[PDB]
Design a protein around this ligand. Structure first.
Ligand SMILES: O=S1(=O)NCc2ccc(Nc3nccc(N(CCCO)c4cccc5[nH]ncc45)n3)cc21
Length: 257
């Protein structure tokens, strides 16, 4: 738990979200703060992110119980990737490849830590700099049990279907391979400069489209290798869909080529 005394908030708003500062041992650290049901979701996120430690996942500083309930993270100054790219269409393809490779290195670690994100989308990638991305928003994330490969969704809550693999929609099964499907949608978003996927379509319409074997097209100016990778992530049969080690490798090879 954090010390309220050591936390300072801006008035300006970023429930509610605020930018702040927390006095660490000697340096002052810029932080982003969620300020409060909606509480169990924030507790689940705190519980997960306290077990995570990776350069490509947003770091939790801690929980402050004061006048309000607060979840304090290190600040990723530039904000969500979808919004950033929407306002910065000059960003080169090679820079996008760089950012999406970083996300895949982050997801490779999660996979290895046996956690499922369950909400991997461009809106949940935050930028530290134009060349440094972190995965955020672990509200729906689940620590897999030692004896299982997947999480079985029970209660009906947030359901971002446009990022969900068929086995999630059809069998309520979430695994690292389902996160791979979502990563594919995230790539598509990033190479489309933060445009929403399957625009104009209902969730049930997206599902019907995918079952016919149809996929979203190649965004303008997306190199074909990256589009080929999106299609691989969108492999229907989860058995034959790649995991984050295979996905990360292919981005690494391409990027460094
Ligand atoms: O709230 S914003 O989308 N409005 C513009 C802007 C600019 C920078 C950040 N950066 C940032 N950097 C780290 C964490 C964090 N947030 C707020 C995200 C809004 O949901 C968080 C606070 C607490 C827990 C969190 N988990 N994931 C993000 C996050 N936000 C966030 C935003």
């Amino acid at each position: 738990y954090l010390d309220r005394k050591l936390l300072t908030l801006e008035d300006k708003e970023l429930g509610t979200v605020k930018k702040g500062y927390y006095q660490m041992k000697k340096v002052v650290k810029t932080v982003a703060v969620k300020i409060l049901a909606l509480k169990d979701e924030l507790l689940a996120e705190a519980n997960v992110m306290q077990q995570l430690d990776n350069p490509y996942i947003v770091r939790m500083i801690g929980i402050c119980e004061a006048e309000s309930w607060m979840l304090v993270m290190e600040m990723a100054e530039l904000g969500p990737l979808n919004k950033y790219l929407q306002q910065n269409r000059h960003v080169k393809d090679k820079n996008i490849i760089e950012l999406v490779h970083q996300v895949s290195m982050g997801m490779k670690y999660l996979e290895e830590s046996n956690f499922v994100h369950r909400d991997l989308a461009a809106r949940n990638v935050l930028l530290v700099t134009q060349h440094y991305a972190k995965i955020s928003d672990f509200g729906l994330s689940k620590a897999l049990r030692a004896d299982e490969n997947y999480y079985k969704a029970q209660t009906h809550g947030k359901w971002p279907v446009k990022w969900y693999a068929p086995e999630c929609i059809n069998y309520y099964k979430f695994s690292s391979k389902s996160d791979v499907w979502s990563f594919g949608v995230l790539m598509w978003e990033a190479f489309s400069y933060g445009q929403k996927p399957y625009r104009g379509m209902k969730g049930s319409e997206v599902t019907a489209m995918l079952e016919k074997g149809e996929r979203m097209g190649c965004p303008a100016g997306c190199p074909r290798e990256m589009y080929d990778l999106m299609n691989l992530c969108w492999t229907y049969d989860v058995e034959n869909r790649p995991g984050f080690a295979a996905v990360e490798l292919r981005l690494r090879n391409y990027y460094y080529d």
